[PDB]
Specification:
The protein is mainly α. Helices cover about 70% and strands about 0% of the residues. α2 runs antiparallel to α3 and α3 runs antiparallel to α5. GO terms for molecular function: lipid binding.
């Protein structure tokens, strides 16, 4: 068997998690910034950006809850807002990291590492495969899959140029 089902979408948490260690390694480059009470603000622009960027896939599951056929529309509703708040969690601030500029960057790095723990709950949830009808969530889990590798490094892209501006 193979061309019918059984592939399981658990690999989504594997490729997504592996992509979480890529941004955690770049954030270390941010430390290489200036120091005049005006070097962290730019760090919040690149970090607060990955929040709305990675928080975008969260809306990809809504398609399954927008018309799910079972008790999954709810489980898929949490992974959506649950993973959307973990990233946008620090998106509620902005003037604080630039004001204290103490350790506001770790807020995002620690917020992304969690987005991976969420893929574990949704990975085992759809892993059951005991729905036998919720095939609409199939194309809903592969949505974040591509949004995880693209958003995960979303911060490593700016963070890198953030430690050297320009």
């Amino acid at each position: 068997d193979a061309p019918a089902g059984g592939n399981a979408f658990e690999e989504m948490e594997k490729h997504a998690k592996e992509f979480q260690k890529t941004f955690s390694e770049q954030f270390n480059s941010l430390v290489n910034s200036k120091n005049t009470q005006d070097f962290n603000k730019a760090l919040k622009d690149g970090s607060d950006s990955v929040l709305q960027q990675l928080s975008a896939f969260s809306s990809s599951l809504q398609g399954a809850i927008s018309d799910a056929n079972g008790k999954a529309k709810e489980a898929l509703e949490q992974a959506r807002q649950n993973v959307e708040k973990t990233a946008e969690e620090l998106r509620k601030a902005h003037p604080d990291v630039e004001k204290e500029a103490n350790a506001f960057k770790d807020k995002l790095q620690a917020a992304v590492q969690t987005t991976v723990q969420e893929s574990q709950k949704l990975a085992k949830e759809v892993a059951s495969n005991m729905e036998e009808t919720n095939k609409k969530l199939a194309p809903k889990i592969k949505q974040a899959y591509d949004d995880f590798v693209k958003h995960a490094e979303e911060v490593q892209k700016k963070l890198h140029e953030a430690a050297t501006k320009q």
